[PDB]
Amino acid sequence: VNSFSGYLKLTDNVYIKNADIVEEAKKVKPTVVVNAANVYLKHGGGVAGALNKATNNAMQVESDDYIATNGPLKVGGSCVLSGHNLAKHCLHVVGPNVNKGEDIQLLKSAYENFNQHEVLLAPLLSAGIFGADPIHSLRVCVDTVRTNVYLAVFDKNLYDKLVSSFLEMK
Numbered sequence: 001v002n003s004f005s006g007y008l009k010l011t012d013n014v015y016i017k018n019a020d021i022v023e024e025a026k027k028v029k030p031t032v033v034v035n036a037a038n039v040y041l042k043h044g045g046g047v048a049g050a051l052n053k054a055t056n057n058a059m060q061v062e063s064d065d066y067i068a069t070n071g072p073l074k075v076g077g078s079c080v081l082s083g084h085n086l087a088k089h090c091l092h093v094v095g096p097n098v099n100k101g102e103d104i105q106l107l108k109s110a111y112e113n114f115n116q117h118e119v120l121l122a123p124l125l126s127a128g129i130f131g132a133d134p135i136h137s138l139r140v141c142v143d144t145v146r147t148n149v150y151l152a153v154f155d156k157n158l159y160d161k162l163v164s165s166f167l168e169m170k
């Protein structure tokens with residue numbers, strides 16, 4: 001379990017790889033894969049769509065059932081559900097959607113959920129269709145998470161920008 005390779009070490013607990021999080025999950029079968037979710041766990045596109053498609057919609061069926069019960073998540077919150085064929089657990093984490101003016105302060109709350117798990121395979125939160133500054137999201141991740149997070153960034157342009165920015169932060 002958790003046999004990650006090819007990651008660049010940024011800090012003592014944050015690693016980054018240019019890779020598809022679904023392919024990483026299939027190769028490693030991590031204890032926890034993080035989903036970049038919305039409050040209804042509607043896994044339409046991006047990371048959520050990729051993860052759900054890999055489960056042939058089992059993640060969505062499970063998610064629809066959770067929401068039908070406990071109601072939607074809060075922005076900045078999370079829930080632990082099955083990892084299906086990708087991982088033992090999936091931590092669905094809701095970062096703020098700044099395309100909707102959701103408070104960017106909730107990005108720190110979002111990353112704080114990672115601290116409930118020893119080791120996570122995760123995407124960068126609130127970027128892509130959530131619209132947040134991805135350098136900012138990396139900075140909040142590095143500043144906030146206390147446990148071991150392995151970040152999988154599919155987009156090579158974004159990956160190179162993130163790594164170049166991290167080298168210039170310190």
Ligand SMILES: N#C[C@@]1(c2ccc3c(N)ncnn23)O[C@H](CO)[C@@H](O)[C@H]1O
Pocket residue numbers: 019020021022036046047050123124125126127128129134152153154155158
């Ligand atoms: N890069 C990237 C993305 C993304 C989309 C789809 C995937 C995937 N399959 N694996 C990893 N990353 N990934 O992750 C961030 C999620 O907030 C945004 O920048 C997205 O554009």
